[PDB]
Write a protein that binds this ligand. Structure first.
Ligand code: HEM
Ligand SMILES: *[C@@H]1O[C@H](CO)[C@@H](O)[C@H](O)[C@H]1NC(C)=O
Ligand SMILES: *[C@@H]1O[C@H](CO)[C@@H](O)[C@H](O)[C@H]1NC(C)=O
Ligand SMILES: *[C@@H]1O[C@H](CO)[C@@H](O)[C@H](O)[C@H]1NC(C)=O
Ligand SMILES: *[C@@H]1O[C@H](CO)[C@@H](O)[C@H](O)[C@H]1NC(C)=O
Ligand SMILES: *[C@@H]1O[C@H](CO)[C@@H](O)[C@H](O)[C@H]1NC(C)=O
Ligand SMILES: Oc1cccc2ccccc12
Ligand SMILES: Oc1cccc2ccccc12
Ligand SMILES: Oc1cccc2ccccc12
Ligand SMILES: Oc1cccc2ccccc12
Ligand SMILES: Oc1cccc2ccccc12
Ligand SMILES: [Cl-]
Ligand SMILES: [Mg+2]
Length: 324
């Protein structure tokens, strides 16, 4: 079952004796998420980067005070599209034999590195998949984050910086990635993720929304909590995303095989239709990976879809692609 919320959600030291940072060993997997990467590199998750959904939910809550509903929604969304539903294992990065025997195609079980399922374009510190690497820390992109922090945040990353940088990334992908896609699930996640450094990488004794660049580099590049890091003082995820959207409101769309051809998609969900985002994720995205599953896969899909629905925070009706 999905873990419940923390019994005690106070700020506390999370870079503690039981959770030291360690460098990668051969075979250890890290991916496009600095949050999960840091949890693995401090042993809140298995240090090889392969974990169960329950391990992930417990880790994001314990290590960073990510809220329960957000933890459930993201984890089961990722697991459904990128994880092995029979073995209950998900890679936080590249595809690996460590998640067990694969299901039939068209399911990919590609880990969080799989482009276009959860991971997508216009990430802050990772390049678009079209440019060759959607998962490793990129120094040039991080230096741009530093520059935007200097210009809009007095040298710190905050929600104002997030609003400007989110738009800059989108405009750079429009100008250079002929395959740029910015619809449905990615349209939502791209905005939410820009709040996370301000909400969750800021030491919880301060919780002022102002992330310094030493801490930012530590998390984004090295998957490493600052010495004496205290987690956030209460559960949260995407609060302040309205500030990021308001700075430069966008419509969902994609380039259409050429640069500078961004074409709005009226069949995409947007922030006015969160329940459509959920329904398409299940009916189209998940269903297309598993169109006619065998008995044990069908059971695992339905269980994980029930868990996903527990995380749906927008008053939506559950949908059932494989029946009740
Ligand atoms: C709850 C389970 C979570 C999963 C499965 C997850 C997975 C992912 C994935 C696959 C991405 C790639 C999105 C992209 O293409 O840019 C991403 C982005 C990101 N996640 Fe998470 N995430 C989770 C929770 C968290 C938490 C708790 C934090 C912080 C504590 C966090 C911080 C970030 C950041 C900062 C990015 C954007 C990085 C960048 O654009 O450079 N995530 N997440
Ligand atoms: C919750 O944890 C904090 C920090 O560890 C501690 O100060 C506080 O006493 C705890 N609360 C309860 C009810 O145990
Ligand atoms: C190109 O875009 C499509 C989605 O429209 C996606 O399936 C494909 O993986 C993308 N490839 C790259 C390398 O961006
Ligand atoms: C990092 O991002 C820059 C800017 O988009 C890109 O030119 C470069 O190839 C990327 N990769 C590395 C390894 O720097
Ligand atoms: C970001 O920092 C700048 C400079 O200190 C400030 O003007 C702006 O109000 C800050 N934004 C937020 C949301 O804290
Ligand atoms: C999803 O499928 C259900 C039937 O299982 C249907 O009622 C619903 O309208 C579908 N939603 C979308 C957005 O296709
Ligand atoms: O874990 C996550 C990663 C990226 C985006 C998210 C948006 C909402 C809730 C969780 C998210
Ligand atoms: O309202 C939102 C929009 C997009 C992403 C989010 C992630 C977490 C929490 C709320 C979010
Ligand atoms: O953060 C949020 C929470 C709930 C609803 C939202 C709607 C739009 C934009 C952001 C939102
Ligand atoms: O865009 C939105 C509108 C209303 C409620 C939401 C809840 C979560 C995430 C997004 C939302
Ligand atoms: O719980 C949520 C968090 C972020 C985005 C969402 C979009 C739709 C439905 C639920 C959502
Ligand atoms: Cl919570
Ligand atoms: Mg990306």
């Amino acid at each position: 079952l999905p873990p419940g919320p923390l019994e005690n959600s106070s700020a506390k030291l999370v870079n503690d004796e039981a959770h030291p940072w360690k460098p990668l060993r051969p075979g250890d997997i890290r991916g496009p998420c600095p949050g999960l990467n840091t949890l693995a590199s401090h042993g809140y998750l298995p240090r090889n980067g392969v974990a169960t959904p329950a391990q992930i939910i417990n880790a994001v809550q314990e290590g960073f005070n990510f809220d329960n509903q957000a933890a459930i929604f993201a984890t089961y969304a990722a697991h459904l599209v990128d994880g092995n539903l029979i073995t209950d294992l998900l890679s936080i990065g590249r595809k690996t034999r460590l998640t067990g025997p694969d299901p039939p195609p068209p399911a990919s079980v590609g880990g969080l590195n799989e482009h276009g399922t959860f991971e997508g374009d216009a990430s802050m510190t990772r390049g678009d998949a079209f440019f060759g690497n959607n998962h490793d820390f990129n120094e040039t992109l991080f230096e741009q984050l530093v520059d935007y922090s200097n210009r809009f945040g007095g040298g710190k990353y905050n929600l104002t910086v997030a609003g400007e940088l989110r738009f800059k990334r989108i405009q750079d992908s429009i100008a250079t990635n002929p395959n740029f896609s910015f619809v449905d699930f990615r349209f939502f996640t791209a905005y939410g993720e820009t709040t996370f450094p301000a909400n969750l990488f800021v030491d919880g004794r301060r919780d002022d929304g102002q992330l310094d660049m030493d801490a930012a580099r530590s998390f984004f590049q090295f998957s490493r909590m600052p010495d004496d890091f205290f987690r956030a003082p209460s559960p949260r995820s995407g609060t302040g995303v309205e500030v990021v959207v308001q700075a430069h409101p966008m419509q969902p769309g994609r380039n259409v095989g050429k640069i500078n051809s961004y074409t709005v998609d009226p069949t995409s969900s947007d922030f006015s239709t969160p329940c459509l985002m959920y329904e398409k994720f299940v009916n189209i995205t998940v269903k297309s990976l598993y169109p006619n599953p065998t008995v044990q896969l069908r059971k695992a899909l339905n269980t994980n879809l029930d868990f996903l629905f527990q995380g749906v925070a927008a008053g939506c009706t559950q949908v059932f692609p494989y029946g009740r």
